[PDB]
Amino acid sequence: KIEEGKLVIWINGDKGYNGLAEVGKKFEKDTGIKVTVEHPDKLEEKFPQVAATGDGPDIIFWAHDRFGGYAQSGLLAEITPAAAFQDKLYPFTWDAVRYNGKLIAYPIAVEALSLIYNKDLLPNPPKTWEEIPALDKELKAKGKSALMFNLQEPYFTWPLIAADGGYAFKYAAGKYDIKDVGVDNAGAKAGLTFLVDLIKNKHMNADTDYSIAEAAFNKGETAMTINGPWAWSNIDTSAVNYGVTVLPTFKGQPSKPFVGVLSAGINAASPNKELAKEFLENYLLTDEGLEAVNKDKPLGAVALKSYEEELAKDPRIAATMENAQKGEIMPNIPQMSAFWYAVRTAVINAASGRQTVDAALAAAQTNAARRKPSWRERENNRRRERRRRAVAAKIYTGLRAQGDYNLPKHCDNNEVLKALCVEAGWVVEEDGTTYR
Amino acid sequence: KIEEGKLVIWINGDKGYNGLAEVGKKFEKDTGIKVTVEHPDKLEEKFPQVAATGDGPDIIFWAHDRFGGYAQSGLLAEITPAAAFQDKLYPFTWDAVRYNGKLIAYPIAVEALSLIYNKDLLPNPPKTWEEIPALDKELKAKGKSALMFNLQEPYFTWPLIAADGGYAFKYAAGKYDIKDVGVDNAGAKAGLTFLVDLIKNKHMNADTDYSIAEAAFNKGETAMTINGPWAWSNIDTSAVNYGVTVLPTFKGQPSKPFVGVLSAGINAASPNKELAKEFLENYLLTDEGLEAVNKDKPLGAVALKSYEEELAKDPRIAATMENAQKGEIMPNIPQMSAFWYAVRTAVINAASGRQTVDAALAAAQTNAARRKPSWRERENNRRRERRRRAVAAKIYTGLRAQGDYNLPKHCDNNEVLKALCVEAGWVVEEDGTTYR
DNA sequence: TTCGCACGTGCGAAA
DNA sequence: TTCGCACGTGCGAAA
Ligand SMILES: OC[C@H]1O[C@H](O[C@H]2[C@H](O)[C@@H](O)[C@@H](O)O[C@@H]2CO)[C@H](O)[C@@H](O)[C@@H]1O
Ligand SMILES: OC[C@H]1O[C@H](O[C@H]2[C@H](O)[C@@H](O)[C@@H](O)O[C@@H]2CO)[C@H](O)[C@@H](O)[C@@H]1O
CATH class of the missing domain: 3.40.190.10 (Periplasmic binding protein-like II)
Structure with missing residues (x-):
């Protein structure tokens, strides 16, 4: 404190x-x-x-x-x-x-995010996302790999999802339409399907995180990585001769990182x-x-x-x-958190095969727009159900007291409900099926 | 995979x-x-x-x-x-x-945990826990402190808790007794009371964690710390001239770290x-x-x-x-995780003042001795409550169907039960009060 | 050991 | 928006 x-x-x-x-x-x-x-x-x-x-x-x-x-x-x-x-x-x-x-x-x-490449394994970095899988094949023969970056936080994957038109929220009339999301549009589908394909074709692993990507680059096992200016001092201490360059294009369109x-x-x-x-x-x-x-x-x-x-x-x-x-x-609006949580769930579930790209981004489209219930709304629900159980509890309390039904020494409320049902002229089966 | x-x-x-x-x-x-x-x-x-x-x-x-x-x-x-x-x-x-x-x-x-001390600051390490608050008074006058260690993991506090008689599980007849937990005994109470006293008298901070203590000893702002052999290499590359010695005693008995x-x-x-x-x-x-x-x-x-x-x-x-x-x-028994969670909660709650030493440790003894219900037992509970609800559901389904009790378009089960009560010769007040 | 009410929230309905 | 049943587990009782 x-x-x-x-x-x-x-x-x-x-x-x-x-x-x-x-x-x-x-x-x-x-x-x-x-x-x-x-x-x-x-x-x-x-x-x-x-x-x-x-x-x-x-x-x-x-x-x-x-x-x-x-x-x-x-x-x-x-x-x-x-x-x-x-x-x-x-x-x-x-x-x-x-x-x-x-x-x-x-x-x-x-x-902002940039493409970091080792000049020793890659004197000329690729300009396009589409030549990445062929690059990884040439480097897999030498024992190394092409690209490894943080697949856990969607910050690192968003440049590719946005490349073909995916947008978090749209700016219009001097305001962010906090409803209008573009994480389910066809552009986001092209971006994510390519990323999931890189994993399906074994060019990247769906469990890769920060330490896994940062180590593979600093030890010289991977030609390129996607990181911010903070990661430079760590590469400086390593024996890697690196250059920082524009992120690759996707479908002739640029990669658009969130700044x-x-x-x-x-x-x-x-x-x-x-x-x-x-x-x-x-x-x-x-x-x-x-x-x-x-x-x-x-x-x-x-x-x-x-x-x-x-x-x-x-x-x-x-x-x-x-x-x-x-x-x-990046927008500073409070619903950033809901958008960041949703897309994080989308990439992780689509990278791991728990969901299709269709299903993950569609689920993310609604989650990024979901409203968090207010404290009062939560307490309203809690209080209403608290009142409900109290009303039922008092009713069954009186039935157990003055009812004088033929009940076992111990029995749930359903047995009391059954015994009070037959008094009113009903027949209750074993599974609760009731009729007159 | x-x-x-x-x-x-x-x-x-x-x-x-x-x-x-x-x-x-x-x-x-x-x-x-x-x-x-x-x-x-x-x-x-x-x-x-x-x-x-x-x-x-x-x-x-x-x-x-x-x-x-x-x-x-x-x-x-x-x-x-x-x-x-x-x-x-x-x-x-x-x-x-x-x-x-x-x-x-x-x-x-x-x-095993040991006392790591800065030889230049404190040439003669204190041999006793009780003399530590006095050492801090001298040390605070230089703008330094005596001791700082991880207060967020119970692994570091245990040697003090165990010194005067606290233990996890008692060993007897060739096995550990999972029901004889000694995190609530007098020895464990005194050990934790001393540590909480160090925090109340501003000789240690309750928010201190690994990186905060490791940074402060390596930077020479505290003359002593508690850490295992893994922490030496960072100190080696630091400027501190350091020694490793036995942990201080408490009430004449040594600190007993879990090995x-x-x-x-x-x-x-x-x-x-x-x-x-x-x-x-x-x-x-x-x-x-x-x-x-x-x-x-x-x-x-x-x-x-x-x-x-x-x-x-x-x-x-x-x-x-x-x-x-x-x-x-340490025992390797499956209950160790439950013992570690309980003592972790206790030390943090006591070090922060959220609970008393007596209340936190009494809750830790019941948690570490709590029998984790098996999957089948959890499932038994889930099915029994599912069966109880379905029975009530079928009763209220039939009451709504063949009752014609003259109620609104939508109404909760409580109102149907209310209408059935008056049919059988009862009266129900608003709050559920029910009699004949 | 089993058991049953309590509990707060999920999910979708009805508006 | 409020609403209500369903959901699986907590807590304690009865044994
Ligand atoms: O992954 C979502 C995350 O993205 C951004 O976080 C960045 C941060 O900007 C950088 O300073 C650095 O810490 O990398 C982070 C990603 O791991 C957003 O700033 C953040 O709000 C969001 O949660
Ligand atoms: O704090 C509870 C923790 O204690 C032990 O963990 C030690 C571990 O033995 C050391 O190797 C080092 O990593 O410090 C840890 C504590 O931060 C237990 O082994 C562990 O199960 C327990 O959670």
């Missing part, structure tokens, strides 16, 4: 938390506040559960697509810095991270609101603060106008943005 | 899976059989779910306490090693992997059983094989006598074994 005079941080484990801790130490020595950095599993899930009761960290670090839903359950609101602080940063970044006209986190970077803006939301239950902002704006949104974090794990296209002009000329960042221009920024 | 002619292995993320991968690479070089090593989260729980349907890996690596529950479910191949090979390992390691007379896993190493034998079991659904037995016997359980895994992450006191005579020359191993002699080998 929170407490005054301290600062705790929740960032994803694949991020530069150790470089984030190097500056929290620089903050501590300056004005006396100990800063600790923790990278918990499933932090984007634990936060909306615990912070309702006042728990959680002072600041949470996640991409912006969840954040509007976090704002909607009242976990942050109304963050305002001065314009000197509002403009040492990019206008598109603020737009994504503002829910209903209110800034809800400090944007920290811009991330994420890493953001720091201040917990509305924190007591360190201003102290945390002291960390945010004055000690880590500086050149030297982003350096310490980027040296550990590359943030990607950082959003600080000052620091980014140094990073934008790294050819790896330039390729990361060639992929992002081809993609779309 | 597992393919014929391939080997896939599951080991915990804190072990040297990269070292184990190099052993598989040599196995691939001599027999042409690819070996893939994965470290998925919650593998101790994932395995009994997938392996029942014939899925899971070929070989699973875990401490020996979980294997008996696996074997009772028929998930493991029975280990058939030559008598000549069984003599190559310490006999008591074979005992940890014996269940119902059969051998069910290949014992790899012996693991675990890292073991490799063979999935019963594996068409590569002969291949898995070959890889474990002639490539891993050798000097060169265990050395490769050990150089990655220290295994501890290996079961193989030939390589252990070399590893025993290590003062850190002779200290790890000094703690082991004061502790106990």
